Design a protein around this nucleic acid. Structure first.
Ligand SMILES: *[C@@H]1O[C@H](CO)[C@@H](O)[C@H](O)[C@H]1NC(C)=O
Ligand SMILES: *[C@@H]1O[C@H](CO)[C@@H](O)[C@H](O)[C@H]1NC(C)=O
Lengths: 577, 79, 94, 107, 97, 108, 94, 79, 98
DNA sequence: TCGAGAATCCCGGTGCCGAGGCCGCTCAATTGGTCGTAGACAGCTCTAGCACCGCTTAAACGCACGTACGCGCTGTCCCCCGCGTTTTAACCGCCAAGGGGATTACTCCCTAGTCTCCAGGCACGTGTCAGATATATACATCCGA
DNA sequence: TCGGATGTATATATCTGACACGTGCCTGGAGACTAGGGAGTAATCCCCTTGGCGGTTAAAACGCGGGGGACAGCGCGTACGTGCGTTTAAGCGGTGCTAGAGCTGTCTACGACCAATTGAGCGGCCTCGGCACCGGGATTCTCGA
């Protein structure tokens, strides 16, 4: 690529001068630790019964998710300093850095034995074996569907199988801008030179924009209920329509891009459409990076963990690998513990919206019609702003809604998100919890007493040892989540170490960082530092009352809620040029 | 690239005042770096002092205030 | 004997909140008391100087925030500043 | 009257807001002390104390000792660049010295 | 061709600059450097001329002291010429690294 | 009443007793300031100023100049051991440096 | 403008007492004013802290004398102390 | 009383080894004793003056701590 | 017999003494020296044991820092043996004798 | 590479003194009003900092050079290290006398505070005289010869 | 060693603008009280400091042997100070513009202040377990073949 470029490529090509392939899409994940497969070439643990992990038999992911994380839903403890917006932004950020592709069921109708229906253990099917006494399915012959992750370099069993990354590693607001040139071409309208992004041409919400509609061979959105006939939304990620809250966030981002492009056209009418679109993309990427590294990270790692793993920015460094670590994919999914069993919708008075203001999460997955035909994104955003998140407790790891009745309307049987996460971890073949503790430098427990001491709970240590037998057999997700929380944080020390290291690598290795010299004008950063999420919600959404600074912390009304006019608007006078 | 404004003859004159007879060729880069670090520290302190007073003009009075704070108090420019 | 005031109970509470099981010794308690007293004295002196320094007779949150920004070096200061703001915000709420 | 509620509970901090306010008022610092200054000062002190305590606890756990001793405190303070800069001219009693040797002195 | 041997007019310059009390750094480049450094912290900043003068005086004093200490280190090292290692050692001993 | 005499006249001091007292009282140094403390402070300040100014005047007379410029003040401060110790970390604007050269650097 | 009080005529009076002929330039006037202010601030701060140590809320001649003894190094201090004593004496008699 | 010899040569050797010194000359001990005497004289003078003001005949650890803090060598662990 | 080469047990002593936190100067001689030094300022002065301990800790810390700086100067001078001129230069640079 | 050897490091019992917790209670923090004033805010002004603009010209830049110097190599010896042995007193554990730190009650004298007024100190406006600026001179001082 | 070359302190005009002085005016320092509490001074309690005893043994002092490195030659490449020719923006001096520093007048809400209340934290008094000490075995770095 030419050495004189000042906008990021769609695929993230040549972001690092030394290696153009660093951080590019459709590339294999980087491995911090060597693989821990079953046969050492390509096999997940538990594939062949009777084989033990370091001398101890492997535990079924469903079996370990039945008695470790599951807790009654009536004893929920809301987090007094965590909003649902916090978990939603965490999920949105996870929807940007990684997306592991899976082979299609239709394309695997011959040799892939349609794993979505049957569960014969043949590639690429990795079904979850079921234990007895299961509260939901009493029949042992049943099976939770699961698809093997797509390999990176197909061939002989000479190299350890890796996973392919289908999204840009860098934080460049790729969740709504796409990651491939064919995806980005149809994601922006070419009817004129305004530079705006695609806007749905069928249904509008109070005169505002929405994600463009998409057509697929087997659309899961149509399977919600046939009286709707609302298709799945199209955005930078395939799973943009997984939940209405996530697609409302994507709608907000798209509206932000459209408003920024319109304002820039008003400021500089002489600019062409492509230049306007590139400028809007760059500003939106800087926005996302600023929000993530100023309002989200301090509310995840904690003051100590962030100060130890995310020091002050010195300058751009091209020697740090910016690729997504294979452990980050299974570590950043800790947000499943911060989810809430119900989705909330509120009015301008911040009161429940009829008919269904508190909807169970079971009847909300893959429901694109709720956004279109039930008031838009205003009540969804209000509920996300004014609903406390669920506190992450050792005996209350995750609610049963995403554990027992997730994706019920789409697939034949409900899935189990924690066991799914553990099965994905075993498929990727990452080392055990003890090995990652060794990697982060933390002490490595070996007995029941040591595990109880490090986890500060003897009962949970006994529960874990009843299944795994040894600390080295603990999967990364369970070990990370079950660890005690930090001070003013929401993750354990190991998860904090992993997340901080990965985000430091992503920030230092980013040649288009908003604070990096040359990428942004030396005077524009002062105006960009004044942006904030509630202000931009005020700008691009009809609501009039929002939260104060650090929106992820305020979760009460009207104790700490302020009007739209108080927040300072973003100043774009420095872009006149 | 403005830090080159501190010309090599200027650094040579400063060293001559300090009492240095012979100067190596690599001294100038280190001197420029040290000067930049010291100016960054003093200017940051002065800018913080000015920002506190809701002022947009950084006076010499705030500069000598910052120098006194840093432990390098200067006379002849106020207090 | 008289009632001498020390920060033993508060530092112990902070330690228990951070490390629920790790204990502390008398010498470490004295060291922490001296350190907190020294930091408080430095910040209060800087704030008093700043208050008198622009011809103002009061010390507000802005003076303490500026003193913290000036004294604490590097990222620490920023974090501290944020923490301070958060605390004040809570008093604004209640 | 209404039930007593300590200012630390309102601020959410663990350090004493009232004691800090009294020290500021009676410390000959200013003629008047604002109502928000002691809360900010207590928050900053609590954050610094928590930082040092967490680092010392990490060092003590690395040394297989349950109780925090001044050696662990010095190891935690001197191993952090920002805290070392803060306590540039502070000597910790029975703190020892960071274990280091110059490269040339080695065989 | 009257050419002074290396090391004579250097001492003459040393004596002349020690006997004088002028400013050895050109005013405009130092002002530009100060403005460039300050604008990284707050844009649209205005500097009084006295502010640039005071900053220049403090910088000159600090640099003169550093150069004197570096010369002392170099003389201790059985050398006449100063080297970047001498500057680094002087800064390390002074307590700035 | 009676004729008003400045408190500096009673103590035989050329420095202002009243101004020093007001500065001490309003500088938030202590809640109450005694009567003799401002006079003691004025005497100490007058003696220190007299010493440094006498040394500066001696230097100026040695330099064949009548007025005292900052160079003379710097020479007076640095050439005296006690005053150098008092002002070790004090930089005088346009003061320069005492003329000295290391013995080894001398040509030979 | 407004009254900006500074030690300007007092330094000139001291010079006239010491040197009956020589004058002093404006830059040296400012340097002398800064030196006087710095010494005054240092001594007052030392006296305030020292009185705070002994739980005495009143600064007297003893506190100033002790601060002068602590701060001024070497023979100077002794001379200063002597001078101060004489001044206080001239108050007591008159 | 020539009690400066109380700090024995092995004591200075141990202090140097703690400081990270591999080889120690034979003429260092006199200089080390002189430096220790000067530092102790300064700190003791400050502490004794502090005690002198308070009309006390006993020099408490608090006075020594305050003297060290004034000297720029603030010492923790004693108050 | 077993005779360690010179410069070997010195490194072992360095490693051992940089790991411990004991007091290297004997308590009684230091207390007697402190009393002798204070004798020149006021007669019949009584010292608290805590004051003597604090003085010992401060003196040890100052001497250790001075020795570290002197070792840095010596290693700068292409030498591994500390000499008194290195101590003098370190003190002069730090700003004590200047 | 390959054995001996000495120091260091890793585990098993011992118990002991310091750390964590509990119990009174007391003095400091809290709540509830009051009132004076310090600071926020609006408006005006007129220093003074910022932005071209032309002409010198001292200073920076670039280059040729060769000589003093940084640095590498080498030889001496002698000073400091390692260690064995003997002598010194540091240290540990009571043991007693008491100087003086620490606490408490009376009070009285000194400093905060207030009203008044008049004089010291400041900002103004200025005229002159130390001082900076040319200029020729006689030393002050360095480099082959 | 002595004549020539460069640099500079020195004596002599010549402007020049910085300051020491004179003056009008303003505000705060001082005289003259009143009032209350800070602490000066007895008076007492008992805490911890000092001096002393005596035994163990860790540590310091002394001396012998040797090795390595501090230091002084000796030399070699080089790089940087010195001077000359070329180029450059620094400084000066004017000119113009307006940003905002600073000042003044209003008004309010915010903190000092006082009284009653009560509970948060501190001193004393426990009780137990984390680790310093003790011992024995495994590990490792050093050093002579
Ligand atoms: C089916 O979806 C439509 C979408 O408009 C909705 O109105 C209707 O209530 C849904 N029916 C059920 C039974 O959920
Ligand atoms: C970049 O980071 C690497 C470690 O990943 C570090 O070694 C290197 O020095 C860094 N480079 C710069 C220019 O800071």
């Amino acid at each position: 690529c030419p050495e004189q470029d000042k906008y990021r490529t769609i695929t993230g090509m040549c972001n690092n001068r030394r290696s153009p392939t660093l951080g590019a899409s459709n590339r294999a994940f980087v491995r911090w630790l060597p693989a821990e497969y079953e046969d050492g070439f390509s096999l997940p643990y538990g594939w062949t019964p009777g084989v033990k992990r370091n001398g101890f038999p492997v535990a079924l992911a469903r079996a370990v998710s039945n008695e470790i994380v599951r807790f009654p839903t009536d004893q929920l403890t809301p987090d007094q300093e965590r909003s649902l917006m916090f978990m939603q932004w965490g999920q949105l950020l996870d929807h940007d850095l990684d997306f592991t592709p899976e082979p299609a069921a239709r394309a695997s109708f011959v040799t892939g034995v349609n794993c979505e229906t049957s569960c014969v253990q043949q590639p690429p099917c990795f079904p979850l074996k079921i234990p007895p006494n299961d509260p939901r399915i009493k029949n042992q012959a049943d099976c939770i569907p699961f698809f093997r992750s797509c390999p990176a370099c197909p061939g002989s069993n000479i190299t350890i199988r890796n996973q392919i990354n289908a999204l840009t590693s860098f934080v460049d607001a790729s969740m709504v801008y796409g990651s491939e040139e064919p995806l980005a071409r149809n994601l922006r309208n070419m009817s004129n030179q305004l530079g705006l992004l695609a806007v749905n041409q069928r249904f509008q919400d109070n005169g505002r924009a929405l994600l463009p509609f998409d057509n697929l061979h087997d659309d899961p959105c149509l399977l919600t209920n046939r009286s709707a006939r609302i298709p799945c939304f199209l955005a930078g990620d395939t799973r943009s329509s997984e939940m209405p809250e996530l697609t409302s966030m994507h709608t907000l981002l798209l509206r932000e891009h459209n408003r920024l492009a319109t304002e820039l056209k008003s400021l500089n009418p002489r600019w062409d459409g492509e230049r306007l679109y590139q400028e809007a993309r760059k500003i939106v990427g800087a926005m996302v990076q600023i929000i993530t590294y100023r309002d989200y990270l301090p509310l995840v790692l904690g003051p100590t963990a962030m100060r130890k793993y995310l020091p002050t920015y010195r300058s751009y460094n091209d020697s740090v690998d910016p690729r997504i670590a294979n452990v980050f994919t299974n570590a950043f999914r800790y947000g499943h513990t911060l989810i809430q069993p119900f989705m909330f919708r509120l009015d301008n008075r911040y009161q429940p919206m009829e008919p269904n203001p508190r909807v169970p999460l079971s009847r909300v997955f893959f429901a694109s019609w709720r956004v279109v035909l039930e008031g838009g994104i205003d009540p969804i955003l209000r509920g996300l702003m004014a609903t406390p998140a669920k506190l992450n407790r050792q005996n209350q790891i995750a609610v049963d809604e995403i554990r027992e009745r997730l994706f019920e309307q789409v697939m034949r049987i409900g899935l189990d998100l924690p066991a799914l996460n553990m099965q994905r971890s075993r498929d990727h073949g990452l080392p055990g919890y003890n090995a990652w503790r060794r990697f982060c430098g933390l002490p490595q427990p070996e007995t029941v007493g040591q595990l109880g001491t490090v986890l500060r709970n003897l009962k949970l240590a006994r529960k874990l040892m009843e299944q795994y037998g040894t600390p080295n057999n603990i999967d990364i997700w369970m070990g990370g989540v079950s660890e005690p929380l930090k001070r003013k944080g929401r993750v354990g020390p190991l998860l904090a170490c992993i997340i901080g290291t990965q985000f430091r690598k992503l920030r230092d290795g980013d040649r288009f960082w908003w604070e990096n010299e040359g990428v942004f004008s030396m005077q524009q950063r002062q105006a960009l530092a004044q942006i904030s999420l509630p202000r931009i919600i005020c700008d691009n959404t009809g609501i009039t009352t929002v939260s104060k600074n650090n929106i992820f912390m305020s979760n009460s009304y009207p104790r700490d809620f302020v009007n739209c006019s108080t927040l300072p608007a973003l100043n774009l006078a420095s872009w006149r040029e | 690239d403005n830090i080159q404004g501190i010309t090599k003859p200027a650094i040579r004159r400063l060293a001559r005042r300090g009492g240095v007879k012979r100067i190596s060729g690599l001294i100038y880069e280190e001197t420029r770096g040290v000067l930049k670090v010291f100016l960054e520290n003093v200017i940051r302190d002065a800018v913080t002092y000015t920002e506190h007073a809701k002022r947009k003009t950084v006076t010499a009075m705030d500069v000598v205030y910052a120098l006194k704070r840093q432990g390098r108090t200067l006379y002849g420019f106020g207090g | 004997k008289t009632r001498k005031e020390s920060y033993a109970i508060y530092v112990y509470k902070v330690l228990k909140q951070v490390h629920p099981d790790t204990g502390i010794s008398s010498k470490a308690m004295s060291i922490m008391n001296s350190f907190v007293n020294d930091v408080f004295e430095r910040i209060a002196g800087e704030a008093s100087r700043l208050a008198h320094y622009n011809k103002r007779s009061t010390i507000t949150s802005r003076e303490i925030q500026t003193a913290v920004r000036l004294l604490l070096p590097g990222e620490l200061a920023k974090h501290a500043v944020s923490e301070g703001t958060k605390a004040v915000t809570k008093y604004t709420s209640a | 009257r209404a039930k007593a509620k300590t200012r630390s509970s309102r601020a959410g901090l663990q350090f004493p807001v009232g004691r800090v306010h009294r020290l500021l008022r009676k410390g000959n610092y200013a003629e008047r002390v604002g109502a928000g200054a002691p809360v900010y000062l207590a928050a900053v002190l609590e954050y610094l104390t928590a930082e040092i305590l967490e680092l010392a606890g990490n060092a003590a756990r690395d040394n297989k000792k349950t109780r925090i001793i001044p050696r662990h405190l010095q190891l935690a303070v001197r191993n952090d660049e920002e805290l070392n800069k803060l306590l540039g001219r502070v000597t910790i009693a029975q703190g020892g010295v960071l274990p280091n040797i110059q490269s040339v002195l080695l065989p | 061709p009257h050419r002074y041997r290396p090391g004579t007019v250097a001492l003459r310059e040393i004596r002349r600059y020690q006997k004088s009390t002028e400013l050895l750094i050109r005013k405009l480049p130092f002002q530009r450097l100060v403005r460039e450094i300050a604008q990284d912290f707050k844009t649209d900043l205005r500097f009084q001329s006295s502010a640039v003068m005071a900053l220049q005086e403090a910088s000159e004093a600090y640099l003169v002291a550093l150069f004197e200490d570096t010369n002392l280190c170099a003389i201790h090292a059985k050398r006449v010429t100063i080297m970047p290692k001498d500057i680094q050692l002087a800064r390390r001993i002074r307590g700035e690294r």
